[PDB]
Design a protein around this ligand. Sequence first.
Ligand code: CL
Length: 384
Amino acid sequence: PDHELVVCGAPDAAALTGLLTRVRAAATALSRPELTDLAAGLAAAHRGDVPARFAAAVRDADGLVAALDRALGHLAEGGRRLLDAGRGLFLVVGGPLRVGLLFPGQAAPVHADRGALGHKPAEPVDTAVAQPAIIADSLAGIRWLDRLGARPVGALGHSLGELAALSWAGALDADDTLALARARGEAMSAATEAPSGMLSLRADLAAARELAAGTGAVVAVDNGERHVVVAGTRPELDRVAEAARHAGIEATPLAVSHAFHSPLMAPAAEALRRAAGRLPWRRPERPVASTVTGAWWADEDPVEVLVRQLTGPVRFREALGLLDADLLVEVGPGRMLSALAEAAGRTAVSLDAGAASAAGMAAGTAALFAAGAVDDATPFFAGR
Ligand SMILES: [Cl-]
């Protein structure tokens, strides 16, 4: 792999300082094959009940020395918790912390991302192909969490990702979930009655609703205080874009040919109802914060919730606010949701399941280990 995972631990902060000092000494100058042997040995020896924990995803020995330096500086100032998701460096004395899962949906590309600088368009996602592809990668991430014995406090899924969150929670098995994803992407790829799309606003929900009022456009995705997506026909979207320019709000056209998460998806919701109603649904056994209801999943009829998902807004701001977690780990391809969570001031890292680069699997597994959600990082060293 292009990133290595280096974990260790000790019984308390003083003992971890001593160990980290010695690993720093040992690490200076190691070749890449020597660093892999040191990292595989540390993972074998530091598993189980490991009270005070360090984990870092690193490109090479010098990156390990740099991470150790940061951890040691933190402990020297009496720090007991350093969570730097964007550097893949995690240190926790006195955990476990609360870890939540994020299950992504489909990518949301910008139509003409500029440029020179703003200051041929992107192609929309082919949703009939993308939805089952993303859910297959999410289900592979759930198999990694299962191999690790991960113990998150709960999960949420954005739009499509709610299917993977429910599968993780035991409501539906992996084969049925992938089959339902193929049906959902086929239903949602049908053309809308008239040309339609989505418009991203750098504004909050109230500001979006003020811009959209009387226009025909509606809120499609509430991603937080800094990001709300509206949807409608092209005339409706043009009304909002005019309003947004007058108000001084930045409106970004997205590369999509459907007003997803609007009433124009009602035909697709009917077709999804047929596919969903044929499946052997079970009650979820683990907590799921729904981006359909913006509430915890309780006694809900999954067919009704997944059908109204398509016409109603994605309540990611509300669902994320419910999930009380010191650290979030995204389980799926890419880092869409970790970026949205970071924009809400949360700490998040993606496993980036199915990626060419091992960057995400190393950083995400370092996060699970340091936060105490997994006890054994040896699976990262198996089967190379
Ligand atoms: Cl609302």
